[PDB]
């Protein structure tokens, strides 16, 4: 059996929670591969779908994004991407278009999910109404909270459906994730999800 796997690049401003996010997947963390030349840790994240396992090889930087764009080698052969920002830091949202631009320059029209991280933090700065870059670009958006595992599987499920070309692909079980370090208030999640729905009707 030929294994189904995709290079996923995980980009966004430093401090947005990319590493925290990718690390939730325990096996992906244990089996991560260090790429010395590029200063990348590739986390092989397997998800079990109704059509068998799929593996996202997630490329997590070693913080270099704080000092400039990433090198071509980081992006090359990427098959999908997550662009992350921090909903408590508007500037990270403002930089989202730049990340998308750098990404598409090397990778063209690969499937990309936009993720607004740290929604567990009560004082949210970038709210649903303001989040529109994905609309302008054919991208899917999700709120996430890396620290609580909130919506962890969402970006990967959406990407898997796009990559495999199966709108009915499902994850049959969640991968083993690091136990939440903060609680994501369910009422707050419900509100945020509602706010996003409302926003999509504008």
């Amino acid at each position: 059996e030929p294994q189904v796997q995709f290079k996923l690049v995980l980009v966004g401003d430093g401090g947005t929670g990319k590493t925290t996010f990718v690390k939730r997947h325990l096996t992906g963390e244990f089996e991560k591969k260090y790429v010395a030349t590029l200063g990348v840790e590739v986390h092989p994240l397997v998800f079990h779908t109704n059509r068998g396992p799929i593996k996202f090889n997630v490329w997590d930087t070693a913080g270099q994004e704080k000092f400039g764009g990433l090198r071509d080698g980081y992006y090359i052969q990427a098959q999908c991407a997550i662009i992350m920002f921090d909903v408590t830091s508007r500037v990270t949202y403002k930089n989202v278009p730049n990340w998308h631009r750098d990404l598409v320059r090397v990778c063209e029209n690969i499937p990309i999910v936009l993720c607004g991280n740290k929604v567990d933090i009560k004082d949210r700065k970038v709210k649903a109404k303001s989040i529109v870059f994905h609309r302008k670009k054919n991208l899917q958006y999700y709120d996430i909270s890396a620290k609580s595992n909130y919506n962890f599987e969402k970006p990967f499920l959406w990407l898997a459906r796009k990559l495999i070309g199966d709108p009915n692909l499902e994850f049959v079980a969640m991968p083993a994730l690091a136990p939440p370090e903060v609680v994501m208030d369910p009422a707050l999640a419900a509100q945020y999800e509602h706010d996003l729905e409302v926003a999509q009707t504008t």
Binding site: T37, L38, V42, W59, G73, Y74, I76, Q77
Partner: peptide
């Protein structure tokens, strides 16, 4: 045919003698 880089997991062209992404030589 194509080969997978053992360092970074990128799939490379049959004619590549080193990984297009991370430069690791093909084993």
């Amino acid at each position: 045919g194509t080969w997978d880089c053992d360092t970074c997991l990128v799939q490379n062209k049959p004619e590549a003698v080193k990984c297009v992404a991370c430069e690791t030589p093909k084993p």
